[PDB]
Amino acid sequence: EVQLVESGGGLVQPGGSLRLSCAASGYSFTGHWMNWVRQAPGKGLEWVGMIHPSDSETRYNQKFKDRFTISVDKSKNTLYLQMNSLRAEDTAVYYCARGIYFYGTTYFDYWGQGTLVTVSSASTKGPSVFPLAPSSGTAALGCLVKDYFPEPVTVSWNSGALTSGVHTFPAVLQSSGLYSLSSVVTVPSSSLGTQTYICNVNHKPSNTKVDKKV
């Protein structure tokens, strides 16, 4: 059965380059056109281009012709995307997808899981964690997980003892190129005298772990 698996994604600096791979198994590789399709975070889909594994015939979306090269090694059942001179707008999940090119032009019947490419000039850095203190019958507290790179961080409360009413927000990319996120929880006002609240923050890319009492 058709199986598509992308690899090669990750962090890259502006002006950098990357080669993505797509291993296509479980069917006759030389029988169908293969495609790259990219989707920026929050956004919809952009078709990069296509290649026929039999003879490496290509067709590109004009917008990608200068900087993107599609190739294939039919002996390895593998498709490639070489992406050059990268820029912030190239940040996206990149999918390989099998084309049906038969009714008119092409639609996509099988897709890979996608590989994320993130273009950034920031430097690896673990977060600083600051309390969001409950104000002097429901109260809110939280932690501010500020100035880290790359994503992700994880946040738990009271080592997982506290889960109800927790909201951990999507990270925001700041103008510095570092991320920030907040995690909050609503609790009984009565509890603030008696119950301890600690956020447990992990940032694996920097091997940073922080517990903050609120």
Binding site: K43, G44, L45, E46, W47, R59, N61, Q62, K63, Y95, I100, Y103, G104, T105, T106, Y107, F108, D109, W111, G112, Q113, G114, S128, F130, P131, L132, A133, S135, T138, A140, G142, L144, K146, H167, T168, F169, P170, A171, V172, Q174, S180, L181, S182, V184, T186
Partner: protein
């Protein structure tokens, strides 16, 4: 190139509803339009191609119609597994081009946010930056307006927001807004206020603190 215009951008519906999603092409694409369903963190799945042909395995509640420039995806009766993002894609010419998507979420009753404001910590102030946070908790619909005020001066350009996806238990959203000031600017002012506008509120709610209180 063909530009695909998809509407609505967002729709809140209930299980059992008939859902109608439209795609308009900038010029004719004959009968060749495909539809995909996408769930968060997953790849798109093909539902329909050539306007109306279901991919084998796609449930019969999904249907497609249209030709030329005007097309529709219909879900005859919405099921729980159907809440998701849908995209159209023309396949009449190259380059291949997509609509910008329709996000289908769960309808519930209007709920006003509970609003909370948090001052910067003393520890952060030592770094030379002040972050002021405003929380809008468990509200519906998603649309809401946060205005920061510093000593009653309306702030612009120095805040960022993010929003959770619909809560799995109560179908509400939460939102945090963060106002970022230098320590010097922070210490030049007394009253910090977060003013919230929302459908559930008959007039804007303001939460405030005084620096040092």
């Amino acid at each position: 190139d063909i530009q695909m215009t998809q509407s609505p951008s967002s729709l809140s519906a209930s299980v059992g509803d008939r859902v109608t999603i439209t795609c308009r092409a900038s010029k004719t694409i004959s009968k060749y339009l495909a539809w995909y369903q996408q769930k968060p963190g997953k790849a798109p799945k093909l539902l329909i191609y050539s306007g109306s042909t279901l991919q084998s395995g796609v449930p019969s509640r999904f249907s497609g119609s249209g030709s030329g420039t005007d097309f529709t995806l219909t879900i005859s009766s919405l099921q729980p597994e159907d809440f998701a993002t849908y995209y159209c894609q023309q396949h009449n010419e190259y380059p291949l081009t997509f609509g910008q998507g329709t996000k289908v979420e769960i309808k519930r009753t209007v709920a006003a946010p509970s609003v909370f404001i948090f001052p910067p910590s003393d520890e952060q102030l030592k770094s030379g930056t002040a972050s002021v946070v405003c929380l809008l908790n468990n509200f519906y619909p998603r649309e809401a307006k946060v205005q920061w005020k510093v000593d009653n001066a309306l702030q612009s350009g120095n805040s960022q927001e993010s929003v959770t996806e619909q809560d799995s238990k109560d179908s509400t959203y939460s939102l945090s807004s963060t106002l970022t000031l230098s320590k010097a600017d922070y210490e030049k002012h007394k009253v910090y206020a977060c003013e919230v506008t929302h459908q559930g509120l008959s007039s804007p709610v303001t939460k405030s603190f005084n620096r040092g209180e």
